[PDB]
Nucleic acid binder design. Structure first.
Length: 462
RNA sequence: GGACCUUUAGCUCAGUUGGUUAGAGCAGACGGCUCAUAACCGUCCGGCCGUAGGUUCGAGUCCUACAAGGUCCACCA
């Protein structure tokens, strides 16, 4: 207090460094005490204070008494007393949310105004070590545990500057000690009546049982927060880096290479995933880490290469062999095509490739291969069609081999699915499959029989 | 042409030794908790078990073919 809390300010630095603060205030006992200690240490440390209190809806003696008794304090110590009030909790929740959510979102939206619109650098709110305990357990059983378990964060990146909770250092016990000791009306609240909030019940029955189990609880909990604070952020760095070294890069939406990823250590596999999605919008509500992050991970240790997963806000997750497409977009789409094959001609295909046909007095002399194919005008009925795969397609194989299903092939040649579909097949008028570009040749490739007339097919890119 | 395996709701899996009454999870829609920057709690909607043919009093469960999706071979090299 004055120094336990000043030490704290110093321990966690960047808290007492500059000139501009917006210190918020709500209830009674707690919020007033803050200001006080602030004022004194702001003279002591080069600094302009600005009280800021918002009144939410539930009103009565609370809204008014609270509000006016801060007012008379701002004056009682020459302090700009930036006031406000919103009773559109009722119209806020008529826009999407529950209760205590609208609290912090609105409250903070406001502090944001003050910070930006007042050139302030820090915004401090009093959060006692008990506040902390509360949130830990609260968030222990709720399940957030991750990085987010963490606790109440000492100081964090707020808008422009940072946001500071220097009362984290100290019991609500010692906040009442300091409140009465250094002047103020009824210490704590005899009107806590309100087991309305999960939050409260912890504080009303649960904490105390702990409290009894150990006098110095708000302590064993801070040292905890801090342990996990540092532990957590380290990893974070690693995570981030990992992410980059596993992200197939600049797309519309991002890909992830399963191999390198999974060679990672799980701790990080987790994180980069967490981050990934966060990037991909911002920690959404119905997003059950556990369930989801798990499922992704499952989807990648699978044996089965084809893999779909449906996610929150219609976000979709796909494995194609070693790739991992994240598109909340969609994939279909639709596909398919059927073309006659003009000869000679240069036909472009919907997969950035194309086929070239020409006539040749002499027999082709280019190396053995696949992306080319030779036909006898005679021994087959034209014209030539090139179209997309079809339910039961088959063919017969240059040498021995026999007859084989097209399906059977694409999968052996381990080709992506969206590929398989847009992939060209080449048939004769009679519907006989002749040659599958860069994949397999039939048995009806015109052998050298005689230097009659010849057709040449080159499959090539763009 | 040769060998092995998969298939259950939009998506991921369970499905006892042939009974029958098919079970979870994600998404979707719905209802709550969050005085924290974020990954929780409950309800509901969605079942032709890939087609089609058999063996059985009986089939999701066993056999056949076909089909798709898989792991090898072979042809191709």
């Amino acid at each position: 207090m004055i120094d336990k809390v000043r030490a704290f300010i110093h321990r966690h630095q960047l808290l007492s460094e500059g000139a501009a603060v917006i210190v918020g205030v709500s209830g009674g006992p707690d919020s007033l005490a803050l200001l006080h200690v602030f004022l004194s240490l702001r003279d002591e440390w080069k600094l302009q204070v600005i009280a800021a209190h918002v009144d939410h809806m539930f009103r009565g003696r609370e809204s008014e008494e609270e509000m006016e008794f801060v007012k008379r304090f701002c004056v009682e110590r020459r302090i700009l007393c930036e006031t406000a009030q919103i009773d559109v909790p009722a119209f806020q929740r008529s826009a999407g949310l529950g209760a205590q959510e609208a609290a912090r979102i609105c409250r903070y939206r406001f502090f944001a105004e003050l910070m930006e619109k007042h050139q302030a650098g820090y915004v401090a709110v009093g959060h006692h070590g008990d506040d902390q305990v509360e949130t830990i357990l609260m968030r222990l059983v709720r399940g957030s545990t991750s990085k987010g378990y963490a606790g109440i964060p000492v100081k964090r990146p707020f808008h422009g500057g940072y946001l500071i909770r220097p009362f984290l250092a100290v019991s609500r016990a010692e906040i009442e000690a300091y409140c009465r000791q250094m002047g103020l009306s009824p210490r704590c609240d005899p009107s806590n009546e309100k087991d309305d909030y999960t939050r409260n019940r912890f504080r009303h029955h649960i904490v105390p049982l702990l409290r009894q189990e150990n006098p110095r609880l708000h302590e064993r909990f801070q040292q905890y927060s801090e342990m996990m604070a540092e532990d957590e952020q380290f990893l974070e760095e690693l995570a981030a880096d990992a992410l980059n070294k596993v992200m197939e890069k600049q797309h519309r939406d991002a890909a992830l290479s399963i191999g390198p990823f999974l060679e990672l250590p799980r701790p990080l596999q987790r994180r980069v995933l967490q981050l990934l999605l966060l990037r991909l919008y911002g920690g959404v509500p119905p997003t059950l880490t556990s369930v989801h992050i798990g499922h992704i991970l499952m989807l990648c240790e699978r044996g089965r290469p084809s893999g779909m997963i449906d996610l929150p806000k219609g976000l979709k997750v796909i494995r194609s062999y070693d790739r991992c497409l994240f598109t909340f977009d969609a994939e279909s789409g639709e596909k398919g095509y059927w073309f006659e094959l003009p000869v000679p001609a240069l036909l472009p295909l919907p997969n950035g490739y194309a086929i070239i046909s020409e006539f040749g007095e002499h027999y082709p002399r280019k190396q053995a291969g696949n992306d080319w194919f030779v036909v006898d005008p005679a021994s087959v009925s034209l014209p030539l069609r090139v179209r997309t795969r079809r339910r039961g397609d088959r063919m017969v194989l240059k040498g021995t081999g026999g007859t084989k299903k097209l399906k059977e092939i694409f999968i052996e040649a381990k080709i992506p699915r969206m590929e398989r579909d847009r992939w060209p097949i080449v048939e004769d008028a009679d519907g006989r499959i002749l040659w599958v570009p860069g994949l397999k040749k039939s048995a009806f490739e015109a052998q050298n029989r005689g230097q009659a007339r010849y057709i040449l097919l080159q499959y090539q890119a763009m």
